[PDB]
Amino acid sequence: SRRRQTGEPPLENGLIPYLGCALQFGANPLEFLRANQRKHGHVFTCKLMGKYVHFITNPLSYHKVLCHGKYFDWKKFHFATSAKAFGHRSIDPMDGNTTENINDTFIKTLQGHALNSLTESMMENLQRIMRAWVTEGMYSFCYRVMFEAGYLTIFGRDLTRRDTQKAHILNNLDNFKQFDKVFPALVAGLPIHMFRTAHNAREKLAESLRHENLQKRESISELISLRMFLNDTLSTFDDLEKAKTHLVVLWASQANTIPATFWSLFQMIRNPEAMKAATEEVKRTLENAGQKVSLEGNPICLSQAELNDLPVLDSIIKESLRLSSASLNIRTAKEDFTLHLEDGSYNIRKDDIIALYPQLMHLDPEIYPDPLTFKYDRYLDENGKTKTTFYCNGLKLKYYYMPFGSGATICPGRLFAIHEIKQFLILMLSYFELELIEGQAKCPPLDQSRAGLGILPPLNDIEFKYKFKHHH
Amino acid sequence: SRRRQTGEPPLENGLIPYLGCALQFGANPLEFLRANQRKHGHVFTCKLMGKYVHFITNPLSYHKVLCHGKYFDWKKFHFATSAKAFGHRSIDPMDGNTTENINDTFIKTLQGHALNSLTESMMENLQRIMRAAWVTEGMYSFCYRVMFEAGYLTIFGRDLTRRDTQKAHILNNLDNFKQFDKVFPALVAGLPIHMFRTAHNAREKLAESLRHENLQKRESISELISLRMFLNDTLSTFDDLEKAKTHLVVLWASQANTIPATFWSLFQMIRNPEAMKAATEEVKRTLENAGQKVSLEGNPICLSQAELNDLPVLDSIIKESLRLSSASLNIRTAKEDFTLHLEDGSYNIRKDDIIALYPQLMHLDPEIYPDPLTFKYDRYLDENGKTKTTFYCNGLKLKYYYMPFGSGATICPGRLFAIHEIKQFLILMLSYFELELIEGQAKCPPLDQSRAGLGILPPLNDIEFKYKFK
Ligand code: HEM
Numbered sequence: 001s002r003r004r005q006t007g008e009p010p011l012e013n014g015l016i017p018y019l020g021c022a023l024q025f026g027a028n029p030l031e032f033l034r035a036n037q038r039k040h041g042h043v044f045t046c047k048l049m050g051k052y053v054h055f056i057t058n059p060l061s062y063h064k065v066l067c068h069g070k071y072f073d074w075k076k077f078h079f080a081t082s083a084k085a086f087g088h089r090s091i092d093p094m095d096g097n098t099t100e101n102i103n104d105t106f107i108k109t110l111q112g113h114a115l116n117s118l119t120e121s122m123m124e125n126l127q128r129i130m131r132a133w134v135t136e137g138m139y140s141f142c143y144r145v146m147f148e149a150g151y152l153t154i155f156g157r158d159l160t161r162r163d164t165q166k167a168h169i170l171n172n173l174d175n176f177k178q179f180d181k182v183f184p185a186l187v188a189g190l191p192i193h194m195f196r197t198a199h200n201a202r203e204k205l206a207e208s209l210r211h212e213n214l215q216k217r218e219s220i221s222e223l224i225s226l227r228m229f230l231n232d233t234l235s236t237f238d239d240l241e242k243a244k245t246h247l248v249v250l251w252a253s254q255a256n257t258i259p260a261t262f263w264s265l266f267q268m269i270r271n272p273e274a275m276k277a278a279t280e281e282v283k284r285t286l287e288n289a290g291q292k293v294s295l296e297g298n299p300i301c302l303s304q305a306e307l308n309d310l311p312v313l314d315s316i317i318k319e320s321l322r323l324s325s326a327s328l329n330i331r332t333a334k335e336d337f338t339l340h341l342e343d344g345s346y347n348i349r350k351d352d353i354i355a356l357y358p359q360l361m362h363l364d365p366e367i368y369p370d371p372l373t374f375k376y377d378r379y380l381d382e383n384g385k386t387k388t389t390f391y392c393n394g395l396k397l398k399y400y401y402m403p404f405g406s407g408a409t410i411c412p413g414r415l416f417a418i419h420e421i422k423q424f425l426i427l428m429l430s431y432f433e434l435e436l437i438e439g440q441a442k443c444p445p446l447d448q449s450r451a452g453l454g455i456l457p458p459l460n461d462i463e464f465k466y467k468f469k470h471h472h
Numbered sequence: 473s474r475r476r477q478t479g480e481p482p483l484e485n486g487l488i489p490y491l492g493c494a495l496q497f498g499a500n501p502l503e504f505l506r507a508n509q510r511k512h513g514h515v516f517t518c519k520l521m522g523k524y525v526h527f528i529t530n531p532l533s534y535h536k537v538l539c540h541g542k543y544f545d546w547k548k549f550h551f552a553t554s555a556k557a558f559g560h561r562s563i564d565p566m567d568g569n570t571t572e573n574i575n576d577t578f579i580k581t582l583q584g585h586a587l588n589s590l591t592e593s594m595m596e597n598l599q600r601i602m603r604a605a606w607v608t609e610g611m612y613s614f615c616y617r618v619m620f621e622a623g624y625l626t627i628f629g630r631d632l633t634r635r636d637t638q639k640a641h642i643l644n645n646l647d648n649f650k651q652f653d654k655v656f657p658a659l660v661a662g663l664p665i666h667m668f669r670t671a672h673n674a675r676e677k678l679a680e681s682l683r684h685e686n687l688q689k690r691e692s693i694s695e696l697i698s699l700r701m702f703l704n705d706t707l708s709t710f711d712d713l714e715k716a717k718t719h720l721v722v723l724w725a726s727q728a729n730t731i732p733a734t735f736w737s738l739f740q741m742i743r744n745p746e747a748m749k750a751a752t753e754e755v756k757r758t759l760e761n762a763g764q765k766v767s768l769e770g771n772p773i774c775l776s777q778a779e780l781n782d783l784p785v786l787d788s789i790i791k792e793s794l795r796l797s798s799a800s801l802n803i804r805t806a807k808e809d810f811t812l813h814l815e816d817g818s819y820n821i822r823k824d825d826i827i828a829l830y831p832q833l834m835h836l837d838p839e840i841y842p843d844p845l846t847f848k849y850d851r852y853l854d855e856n857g858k859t860k861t862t863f864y865c866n867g868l869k870l871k872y873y874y875m876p877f878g879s880g881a882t883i884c885p886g887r888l889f890a891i892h893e894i895k896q897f898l899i900l901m902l903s904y905f906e907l908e909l910i911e912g913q914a915k916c917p918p919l920d921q922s923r924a925g926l927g928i929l930p931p932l933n934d935i936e937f938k939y940k941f942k
Pocket residue numbers: 078102103106110249252253254256257260327329330403404405406409410411412413414416417418454455
């Protein structure tokens with residue numbers, strides 16, 4: 001058993017299998033982390049996921065962890081977790097299965113010219129999918145629409161199989177739901193065969209993502225066409241493993257985007273001021289880009305710049321994620337060393353984890369007054385432009401909004417994710433009349449079973465009503 | 473990391489913090505163990521609760537694990553688990569904190585002469601609590617109120633200084649017990665109690681009420697608690713709080729299985745008309761010719777140990793209810809490296825490995841119990857209407873076929889009292905009340921497997937029933 005040595009942080013004994021564990025018994029990961037802050041101050045160590053995990057919780061010390069330090073390994077833990085959860089051999093080039101740098105592949109094909117073609121394809125796919133009042137769970141609606149749109153955008157479409165396209169997508173959606181469901185457990189080292197349904201779901205998704213089946217598809221993303229090419233040319237992976245590297249991309253493209261979309265839609269519709277400000281901005285932008293909206297007419301086309309210069313939508317989305325983001329931001333100690341923070345100096349052993357839990361900052365009332373209130377204009381300045389000035393103890397923060405991470409540990413899809421959510425909100429507002437069945441119903445609590453994993457979904461779905469607009 | 477070596481069982485890769493973990497993600501502990509049987513056969517090793525746990529799932533090998541084995545330590549894990557969940561220093565006499573043997577203390581105060589007084593007191597306490605409109609209520613919630621209070625008063629006595637506020641003391645303890653017990657599957661697994669703020673305060677408020685200074689104010693305390701106070705004071709160097717926590721252990725053990733056991737026994741009996749009829753007829757016979765009349769505004773019913781014991785219909789109804797709800801992990805620790813010889817073969821076990829049975833697997837085995845998921849109220853009755861003790865597996869007569877109280881030295885010291893209290897409760901319900909379910913044709917609730925490993929599993933949801941004084 002491990003004992004706190006000299007200069008080491010306070011050590012909380014107790015095994016925490018994973019952050020969302022024991023939710024059914026009344027566990028609350030956020031409040032648990034807060035309670036340790038009060039007990040131990042801003043740096044403490046938990047036995048978390050079979051690791052020793054040093055939480056750094058002072059917003060003003062974040063920059064000391066997010067810089068490219070000499071004793072930080074920002075990939076080891078991620079690579080190992082991906083292997084476990086998806087079931088493939090290591091993709092760390094250091095283990096000799098590939099010479100590919102997957103991060104460069106993501107950056108290369110998720111930004112620049114590639115991003116433009118993704119964005120354009122998503123807009124086209126969203127309109128094909130989205131074109132009386134219908135009542136439905138809002139999460140379930142966002143799941144259908146966004147899953148299909150994102151799947152077809154990243155993995156292209158099977159045009160030989162047109163009439164069985166809705167069957168294939170519904171199977172995939174269902175399989176994805178069942179696999180993603182158990183993901184918090186998988187990351188933690190719990191065996192997938194404890195989850196027979198999720199295990200079958202996973203392998204069925206992997207099957208559908210074998211190169212043999214992806215070669216039948218057209219308008220495949222540049223990301224997946226390149227990843228196929230480098231699987232083939234730079235790795236000694238077998239055919240199933242290859243399929244699972246594409247499953248890693250399916251999961252990453254989907255697991256945060258779906259709940260982010262829900263929250264952004266829910267929070268807009270729920271708050272009449274947000275809805276009015278969003279509705280006007282979208283009208284103004286479509287009007288003077290000359291884009292007509294109709295169900296049967298020609299599609300809408302928006303420039304990168306027109307999509308990007310939507311500050312109200314950006315603020316709505318940022319505020320939605322400030323409230324729902326629950327990532328564990330992680331790196332591993334390359335060796336024994338001393339970490340120097342504003343809070344003091346702490347000795348860290350080799351292979352210890354150094355973690356941030358930025359939800360603690362996002363909900364900090366010192367940085368964000370009334371932190372639990374959705375303020376649609378929170379990230380707008382006096383000019384109605386995107387606001388970038390936020391403070392802690394009078395000091396201007398470099399890191400204050402982190403739902404995509406930061407540094408080298410940063411979502412390569414982040415610009416695309418924002419584009420796709422903006423596109424969805426644009427189309428929802430343009431195409432439909434929208435009402436909450438319970439306009440006064442409390443906001444669902446976050447479901448903290450996925451704490452650590454990204455954007456948290458609602459604990460319960462909420463019903464809403466939608467109706468195609470008539471344009472006069 | 474550990475690998476499977478020569479002669480060791482199949483080693484399952486994967487961390488399992490506790491058996492009821494990840495239920496929210498669709499885990500199912502019973503089916504998980506069955507799936508391992510199928511894949512690996514009757515002996516397999518899981519990384520469970522931070523240990524390497526060898527499961528022995530062939531019923532014909534149970535006898536080789538349950539015998540007083542020279543290679544087994546049947547107390548090490550329990551002592552350590554108790555210390556963690558309740559928050560006290562080791563009670564293992566090897567660790568110098570006490571020289572008391574608590575097993576002997578339990579046996580001495582829960583059986584023999586001591587059992588007579590416990591049984592009498594419970595029957596008195598039950599009657600005081602249970603004594604004309606139809607009242608509708610959740611059946612589990614009802615069994616919880618009544619059995620918790622009856623059992624708390626029987627074990628810990630009554631404060632007669634403050635009769636007018638006793639209902640309030642009991643209600644606070646009841647609520648505090650619920651909150652502490654809710655988190656118990658996590659605690660045994662090593663999850664920290666302070667991760668459950670409400671349960672932690674609840675645990676500590678219960679402990680406060682069971683300090684010797686507060687127990688001293690109480691009267692008609694059980695010989696169990698009196699003797700345990702005595703041996704705390706004379707045989708240990710425990711502090712005042714630790715002394716309270718040793719009494720909290722007993723509160724928990726006396727309550728956590730009895731409450732769900734009672735619910736299942738009542739529910740199963742009301743829901744199955746042939747069971748209700750058989751139980752009603754038997755109870756009346758026994759009261760009649762023990763010369764005991766039943767009235768609300770009358771004198772207490774008194775039954776001997778023999779009269780209570782010779783109730784085979786009630787005994788079968790209780791056994792069959794536990795056959796269907798019992799989910800204990802029966803554990804012992806390997807004192808050293810050794811070879812375990814089973815019907816299945818021979819397996820090398822390491823020092824500090826756990827050897828586990830999960831008897832729910834045998835209780836629900838269709839080879840032993842035809843139609844295992846059906847409650848047959850006469851399943852433990854023979855042709856003669858007396859207790860049936862002959863059950864077979866592959867044509868071999870089983871020594872171990874009904875194990876909800878455990879067996880061997882790892883056996884509930886309170887089992888006789890437990891059956892009496894449930895019999896007494898069922899006798900009084902039949903005697904006092906008209907009873908019916910709101911949905912008599914409604915489905916049986918599923919077991920709640922978040923508590924898998926811990927004893928009798930409660931229903932996942934409560935069910936409503938109506939009652940009325942006759
Ligand atoms: C609101 C939507 C999204 C959010 C909040 C989000 C957030 C994140 C976060 C926090 C990480 C982990 C970074 C770290 O390790 O610290 C990540 C990684 C990643 N994200 Fe996103 N993401 C979103 C959508 C997307 C989309 C649409 C894609 C497009 C394919 C994507 C692709 C990826 C990939 C491939 C990684 C793995 C990075 C690596 O280890 O090389 N994400 N994302």
